[PDB]
Design a binder for this molecule. Structure first.
Ligand code: HEM
Ligand SMILES: CCCCCCCC/C=C\CCCCCCCC(=O)O
Ligand SMILES: [Cl-]
Length: 420
């Protein structure tokens, strides 16, 4: 199945609708698991979804990531030289050091009380006042992430830096926004490089064993220190994605407005199980990652479709999370799907549940921050569910576009907390 011509421009016009539009234009039936091939950025790109597509995408014998993400997105979103761009043993060494920070249960346990405290502070700010879920909980997540990582700055400086991260996250995916995103990336990289250099030179003392110390000690496969700007880029890759949970928190507020019986169950629970299941089904249901790219390292073949060395293979995330072959009633928002699961580690066993990537965290490129992200999102769900939180139901607060990346309600979701 092929779609003719170069469809690069259609990525910007279609956003999250791009993969299902191309499968339709190719003549596939709805719910087909067949790959579809088009041209993007002057080369072939084959779009795959579902369990077999996951197995292909994460097969590092045939897939590489260097050069897969277009720089206009990647250099703004994750920065130059980031772990996302690495392959092979160098990738494994860098990823081990980053997963040691984000993915270890004891470090997650350190994050949990910090994010609960910052969420509670944001929500207290809504009392008798006009709050904004996206802006205020993204800020709360960023404050928690800096405290968690051992980045110790005056409150005004932290808020300003977290604000730059929000501006970057809110703008990197559009034609109008990309100059703003690249401006913020420049300032943040200068800031993080200066901080790493200050730690390495002894001008700033980092808490022993904190994330900041470990990023200052970041080394490559030969044992040599990574340069200071790259280390600062990796420090941002362990703090900015926590800020980005604000997108899921905005959707969670929408979902709580739309699912008042689940909201009641969360408020009446003693266990946190409903809030966890609700947070997971927010990550399954709402659009965040549209798709993600890799490049073939050698000629190969996938379900009768030839895959040429150097072409892109694009895993369609929305189409996997919403595949009727992989899920029962995928268009239904239903936290019961996850009520039998107790931890994020257990949720990893669900093969098509890939909101932050698939396969294995330490041996592949899968996100190492899902435990942090579910911790932050669950804290948000529990605080947003409380009955004194009044979530706006106006159209600009509830609806979101599928044709712009990233997606969120235009207003950010307006909220207030009832007060006496
Ligand atoms: C809104 C929340 C988040 C989303 C939607 C998200 C999504 C993703 C996705 C799609 C990938 C690429 C997976 C692949 O290449 O196959 C990824 C990788 C990564 N994420 Fe997350 N993430 C989030 C939160 C976090 C958090 C909280 C952290 C750390 C504290 C984090 C750190 C990373 C890192 C370091 C990588 C690169 C891993 C590698 O290439 O080996 N992310 N994330
Ligand atoms: C031709 C290449 C086609 C592939 C284009 C892929 C577009 C990907 C768009 C957005 C990726 C979102 C990644 C998740 C961001 C949140 C975590 C973070 O801050 O790093
Ligand atoms: Cl299911």
């Amino acid at each position: 199945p092929r779609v003719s011509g170069d469809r690069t421009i259609q990525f910007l016009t279609d956003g999250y609708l791009l993969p299902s539009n191309l499968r339709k234009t190719a003549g596939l039936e709805p719910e087909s698991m067949c790959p579809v091939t088009t041209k993007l950025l002057g080369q072939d790109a084959t779009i795959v979804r579902g369990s077999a597509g996951i197995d292909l995408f994460y097969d590092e014998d045939v897939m590489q990531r260097e050069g897969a993400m277009p720089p206009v997105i990647g250099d703004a979103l994750v920065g130059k030289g980031a772990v996302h761009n690495l392959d092979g043993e160098e990738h494994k060494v860098r990823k081990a050091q980053m997963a040691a920070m984000a993915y270890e249960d004891e470090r997650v346990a350190e994050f949990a009380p910090l994010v609960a405290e910052e969420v509670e502070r944001a929500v207290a700010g809504w009392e008798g006042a006009q709050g904004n879920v996206f802006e205020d909980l993204s800020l709360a997540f960023g404050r928690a992430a800096f405290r968690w990582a051992g980045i110790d700055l005056p409150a005004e400086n932290t808020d300003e830096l977290v604000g730059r991260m929000i501006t970057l996250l809110d703008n990197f995916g559009t034609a109008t926004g990309t100059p703003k995103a690249f401006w913020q990336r420049r300032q943040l990289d200068n800031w993080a490089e200066a901080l790493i250099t200050d730690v390495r030179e002894g001008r700033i003392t980092a808490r022993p064993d904190c994330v900041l110390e470990h990023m200052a000690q970041l080394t490559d496969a030969s044992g040599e220190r990574v340069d200071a700007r790259t280390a600062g880029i990796e420090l941002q890759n362990l703090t900015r994605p926590t800020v980005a949970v604000g997108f899921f928190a905005s959707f969670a507020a929408v979902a709580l407005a739309e699912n008042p019986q689940w909201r009641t169950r969360i408020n009446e629970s003693e266990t946190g199980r409903e809030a966890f299941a609700f947070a997971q089904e927010v990550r399954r249901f709402y659009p965040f990652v549209p798709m993600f790219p890799a490049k073939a390292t050698k000629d190969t073949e996938f379900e009768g479709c030839p895959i040429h060395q150097g072409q892109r293979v694009i895993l369609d995330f929305v189409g996997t999370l919403h595949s009727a072959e992989e899920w029962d009633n995928p268009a239904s928002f239903d936290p019961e799907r996850f009520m039998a699961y107790e931890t994020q580690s257990e949720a990893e066993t669900i093969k098509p549940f890939i909101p932050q990537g698939g396969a294995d965290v330490r041996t592949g490129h899968r996100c190492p921050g899902e435990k942090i992200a579910v911790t932050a999102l669950s804290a948000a769900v529990e605080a947003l569910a409380r009955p004194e939180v009044r979530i706006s139901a106006e159209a600009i607060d509830i609806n979101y576009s599928m044709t712009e990346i990233l997606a969120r309600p235009k207003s950010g979701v307006r909220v207030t907390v009832a007060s006496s």
